[PDB]
Design an enzyme around this catalytic site. Structure first.
Site, PDB file in Angstrom:
ATOM      1  N   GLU A  74       0.798  -1.225   0.000  1.00 47.81           N
ATOM      2  CA  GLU A  74       0.000   0.000   0.000  1.00 47.81           C
ATOM      3  C   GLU A  74       0.825   1.266   0.000  1.00 47.81           C
ATOM      4  O   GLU A  74       0.347   2.324  -0.373  1.00 47.81           O
ATOM      5  CB  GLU A  74      -0.862   0.045   1.278  1.00 47.81           C
ATOM      6  CG  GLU A  74      -1.812  -1.151   1.294  1.00 47.81           C
ATOM      7  CD  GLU A  74      -2.928  -1.142   0.256  1.00 47.81           C
ATOM      8  OE1 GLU A  74      -2.976  -0.047  -0.453  1.00 47.81           O
ATOM      9  OE2 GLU A  74      -3.722  -2.069   0.094  1.00 47.81           O
ATOM     10  N   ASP A 108      -6.555   6.965  -5.015  1.00 46.86           N
ATOM     11  CA  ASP A 108      -6.029   5.655  -5.247  1.00 46.86           C
ATOM     12  C   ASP A 108      -6.086   5.301  -6.762  1.00 46.86           C
ATOM     13  O   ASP A 108      -6.415   6.186  -7.597  1.00 46.86           O
ATOM     14  CB  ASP A 108      -6.662   4.718  -4.213  1.00 46.86           C
ATOM     15  CG  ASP A 108      -8.079   4.275  -4.508  1.00 46.86           C
ATOM     16  OD1 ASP A 108      -8.678   5.009  -5.403  1.00 46.86           O
ATOM     17  OD2 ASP A 108      -8.597   3.304  -3.972  1.00 46.86           O
TER      18      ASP A 108
END
Ligand SMILES: [Ar]
Ligand SMILES: [Ar]
Ligand SMILES: [Cl-]
Ligand SMILES: [Cl-]
Length: 162
Positions: A11, A20
């Site tokens: 991540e 994202d």
């Protein structure tokens, strides 16, 4: 290697609100703030999460806290999820990490849809389940990640993360 290291690798870590791969507001180590388009919405949710006016920016400490919460919740989710629990309990520890990784990324629900792989995974048929999971929007969208996760699951080793 452990779940924390593994997800910190998958991540990353950003101290500022970002979008994202999906274009959703996020912060820290993979902490989804919101699906809405409103960046204002995003700050509010961030402020609420943190407990102060961050104005879109947090410290490392803060990010690690959200992360801690997020892993914990992921774990607890599985453990209370009924399709989930039994699989998890059937697994060895590396493989459990792989499952946690998926659930953190996609939610209990999204993970719920790997029914066919997962049953294969309950059956310890490493090869098949892996090829099956590969046929997914998940893999097509984030193939490098997906690949590391599916390798971990199949193999039961951290090789993909070395
Ligand atoms: Ar699976
Ligand atoms: Ar899998
Ligand atoms: Cl929160
Ligand atoms: Cl990826």
């Amino acid at each position: 290697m452990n779940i924390f290291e593994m997800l910190r690798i998958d991540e990353g870590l950003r101290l500022k609100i970002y979008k994202d791969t999906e274009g959703y507001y996020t912060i820290g180590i993979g902490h989804l703030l919101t699906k809405s388009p409103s960046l204002n919405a995003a700050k509010s949710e961030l402020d609420k999460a943190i407990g102060r006016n961050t104005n879109g920016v947090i410290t490392k400490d803060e990010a690690e806290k959200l992360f801690n919460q997020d892993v914990d919740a992921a774990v607890r989710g599985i453990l209370r999820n009924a399709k989930l629990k039994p699989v998890y309990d059937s697994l060895d520890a590396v493989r459990r990490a792989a499952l946690i990784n998926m659930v953190f990324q996609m939610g209990e629900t999204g993970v719920a849809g790997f029914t066919n792989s997962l049953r294969m995974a309950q059956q310890k048929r490493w090869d098949e389940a892996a090829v099956n999971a590969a046929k997914s929007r998940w893999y097509n969208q984030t193939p490098n990640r997906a690949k590391r996760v599916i390798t971990t699951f199949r193999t039961g080793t951290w090789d993909a993360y070395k």
